[PDB]
Symmetry: D2
Subunit: 294 residues, 4 copies
């Protein structure tokens, strides 16, 4: 059951740049305590690009262990190399993940038929449910609703999309091509509101790392059909949604958590452990606005 506020978890690092397993476990425990409805370890926000295979696998295992079946674990298994995506998928399945988040291949720019082949190969290799992660702002290519619908028809375990197109009409088009039962989750925090109005049932979220309770209650309001209340949550959260993405979301998020919870700002190159003064100020103002800081 994949719905509600699902953080794309950060991966905390030590000063020496190693995965900080204790900090990661503490973050997961706190996320569950504050109402997060599922967990995505080692997505983009978890710095999947700068983790080795071994580290990727370890973080997935640690997330599964800490969650202890309390909420679903949707493991990142993305790659622009189909064989590598299959390897990550098989590991996550064996480790006990509940589902997989699989990004459209980036950089190499496959055709729609190449996208179909990639996702079909991953779906055929595992029995777990798969959430397609369609993010043209990073991958350049864009899985069409027609390609997505073809995948849904061909593979019973292709069950949903993390839709980061930022084009809300795509939710409507995806309802047509994939069905009303196809699980659509926002890939953008700032438009999670409109996304659910169009038929979405949740958000795989960067902001939830910082404000898990507000984000969970926001999602609950929309699931209950109380869009007036959801708009009030948007009024409280929008400055944060915007501020953490002035620079890379990973870096905005880790700065925010350094202020609220004493989290380490360390990221791996080419991401930077520093931000511009205007970015830090906007994040500070957003945290204060949301009641997370004085």
């Amino acid at each position: 059951m994949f719905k509600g506020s699902i953080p794309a978890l950060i991966t905390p690092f030590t000063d020496n740049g190693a995965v900080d397993e204790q900090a990661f476990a503490a973050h997961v425990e706190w996320q569950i305590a504050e109402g997060s409805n599922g967990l995505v370890p080692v997505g983009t926000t978890g710095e999947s690009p700068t983790l080795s295979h071994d580290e990727h696998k370890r973080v997935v295992e640690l997330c599964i262990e800490v969650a202890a079946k309390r909420v679903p674990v949707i493991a990142g298994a993305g790659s622009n190399n189909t064989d590598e995506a299959i390897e990550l998928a098989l590991h996550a399945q064996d480790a006990g993940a509940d589902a997989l988040l699989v990004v459209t291949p980036y950089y190499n720019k496959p055709t729609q038929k190449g996208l179909f082949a990639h996702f079909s190969a991953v779906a055929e290799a595992v029995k777990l449910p798969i959430v397609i992660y369609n993010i043209p702002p990073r991958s350049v290519v864009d899985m069409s609703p027609e390609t997505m619908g073809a995948l849904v028809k061909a593979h019973k375990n292709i069950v949903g999309v993390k839709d980061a197109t930022g084009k809300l009409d795509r939710v409507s088009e995806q309802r047509i091509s994939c069905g009303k039962d196809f699980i659509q989750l926002s890939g953008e925090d700032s438009t999670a509101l409109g996304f659910n109005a169009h038929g979405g049932v949740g958000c795989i979220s960067v902001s939830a790392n910082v404000a898990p309770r507000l984000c969970s209650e926001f999602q609950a309001a929309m699931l209950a059909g109380d869009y007036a209340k959801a708009l009030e949550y948007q009024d409280r959260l929008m400055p944060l949604h915007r501020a953490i993405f002035m620079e890379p979301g990973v870096c905005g998020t880790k700065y925010a958590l350094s202020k609220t919870r004493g989290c380490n700002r360390k990221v791996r190159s080419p991401l930077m452990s520093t931000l511009e003064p205007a970015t830090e100020a906007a994040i500070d103002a957003a945290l204060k606005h949301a009641g997370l800081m004085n």
Copy 2:
């Protein structure tokens, strides 16, 4: 009161391309009868670019006459020439329009300061409320929420936006920079649903030309907070929203109305009075899906 479903009215032509005043009047009467909450004569969908000044003026006047104060008339007064926009704004005011729809200057690509100066000059010239029509897909330039907020603060009669950015986070940003009382109207039919969820209160609509009752009921559901019902309308209308824009919306709309109501498909060059076979097929299928054919 500017809210709900507000058609950007087509301008019907006769076979020879002349404005068809009888067809226009009948279209307006029907729009009001079917529940449209306001009217925009000679916006982009009314083929403002290909009307002469006299034709523009006549269609605005005729719209005002037919509406007879039953719903607000928000007259198109757009130009990329500030002097021309002022001329159109003053005429619409003198003719008895309730508000003005003023597009961001297209083609000449002014700066944000130029945008401010353009809208300030129009606002200073008239007493009517003005709705800013921000449409980067046509005008290229994009009025920022900062510029918009500055206009709102500077001019009491800058009251709202027809927001055709297609970026729904902009509604949230405009709510901050312009205030919760700033009137935000979707400039895109296909995302009118999410737009109101973000704080919008209506849509200046192309699709309302074809399905005024359904569009009015869709808007009313959202204004009432019934987003479940609004989604049911989206299920019914989305194929139509998509199909009428496969090619220019004016042409898709006039085709749809040729099928439902026997409207003339004539448009003025460079728009074409024809469509591709896939477009017509999709519009036909969409009309059936919506219960209109």
Copy 3:
């Protein structure tokens, strides 16, 4: 016929915003004296959007009179309304223009078939040669090489393009679809160099308003096949090409001319009679680099 450095002439205004006929005539005379190979009155750079029909006509007529058949006059006749483009085209023809510059319809976003219909209608109405002005950065729509080739085949008087796509492979594609004898003129100053290497024979130029001699010599170098010399001119002129377009080219150009020749900076709203301080500073440095100021 149509070749080399062809300024898209500014339209100077007096302090009150009226067309300054004396300043316009002086500018045209100087342009011819300094080596400009042709003249485009009331193009985009001439502030065509903010001139009345009477003013548009008068500036075209004045340009024709001052030129006195010394160089070709390619009159702006652009509109997104086909009927209006025809009216402007016929006036220019009757006035004695040598050719017409006709922009792709902006704002209303016609189809490729609409583009064909528009240009076909203008071509059939006049006997003058027509240069298609393809400028997607302003008009959004983009005339394909296929549509352009179809127009060339259908109308003997469709003779060339002012190509402002900024995609130099389009020159190569247009050579194939329209022929090697199709007259291709750059619509971008900063890439006029590569444009001629691909088969172009000139540039309808904003920068030529400021540096007509240098721009004429730059074009002459390319027409002579001396691309090493042309690159030397590019080294001299590039800072100016860049600086005049940091903000609207009309305003960059009028600022530069205010410094070098005492030209009025007045422009008509929504263009502003000013520039940001960093833009002015960059134009100042560019003029010094080019040897036009000290």
Copy 4:
């Protein structure tokens, strides 16, 4: 070195998808015989995204062995993970490469400061010359001329750029920020002509895989300043430049070589070993036009 026509070599595979070392060596030997001026193993066109670490390293080693110092080997060493890029750089230097081709990080979208940090770290790690591979159409981020200039100033071994922006004014901007001696190589075949007119000295080329002699002669004409001759080569090659990129360039190139030289079409998912019939028709026509097929 670094000048002229430098193929971004394909990596041939067997029917079963394994690297075909015999075919790779034959392709390199033929490239050298036909006049290619340098070699880029395991760039994008070499399917770097779908090669394992082992395969990447082995292909770089094989290229170096076969070249036998006859032309420079500019080894692909790209990653969006700085630590991985450093590992690949240290390997390629140890293996005996003459330079490195280092892509801007893709997918994770670093800031300009992140780009500076990434390239600075790679440059500090090796003594070899580094060519920055700036490709916004794949990586989304775009290294500015200012950032590039800062890198050139900070690191003596940052010597050039494979510029795949497709914006020829960028060559002129890079001349300003990086100097006239900065080595600029086109990253696009179809605009290699204009690119050198702006100051480029070569092209890291996809089309050279198919037509190495013609591409080498084209480049030699430009080095000699014979742009009229260079345009004649563009006339001969443009249909091929266009046709191989109707679908992904790797696939178009391997199809072309299957026709001319009996090369295997096999590629790794998400690239497809098949093309649309219209694409194959266009490539065949372009090969005939270029004199490479009857």
